[PDB]
Amino acid sequence: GSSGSSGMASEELYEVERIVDKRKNKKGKTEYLVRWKGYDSEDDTWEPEQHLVNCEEYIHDFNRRHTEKQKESGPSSG
């Protein structure tokens, strides 16, 4: 299905496009490499999962990619 419906935005700062990387800070904080408008590919920044609120989806998806063998595949019902 399609998961990503806008809801009360009205000119927002920046919407998480997707995760390109993820790591922990020397402090021990989890940071996920997410892109944003204006920021080129090599301009991408690092945001802590904390700042990434309601972005679990993306991260989750991104995590799945990295993860090796975890989620089961299914056919297409309709």
From Swiss-Prot:
Tissues where this protein is expressed: Expressed in the hippocampus with reduced expression in epileptic tissue compared to normal adjacent tissue (at protein level). Ubiquitous. Expressed at moderate levels in all tissues examined. Isoform 2: Most abundantly expressed isoform.
Which ranges are annotated Basic and acidic residues under compositional bias? 18-29, 65-72
Cystine pairs: none
Q: Where is the Chromo domain?
A: 17-72
Which residues, renumbered to this chain, carry the PTM Phosphoserine? Answer: 41
Subunit details for this protein? Forms multimers and multimerization is required for stable binding to chromatin. Interacts with HDAC1 and HDAC2 via its C-terminal acetyl-CoA-binding domain. Interacts with EZH2, EED, SUZ12, REST, EHMT1 and EHMT2. Part of a complex containing at least CDYL, REST, WIZ, SETB1, EHMT1 and EHMT2. Part of a complex containing at least CDYL, MIER1, MIER2, HDAC1 and HDAC2. Interacts with CHAF1A and CHAF1B; bridging the CAF-1 complex to the MCM2-7 (MCM) complex. Interacts with MCM3 and MCM5; bridging the CAF-1 complex to the MCM2-7 (MCM) complex. Recruited to Xist RNA-coated X chromosome.
Domain comment in the entry: The chromo domain recognizes and binds histone H3K9me3, histone H3K27me2 and histone H3K27me3.
Specify the protein name.
Answer: Chromodomain Y-like protein
Species for this entry = Homo sapiens
> Source taxonomy lineage?
Eukaryota, Metazoa, Chordata, Craniata, Vertebrata
Section of the entire sequence shown: 64 to 119 of 598
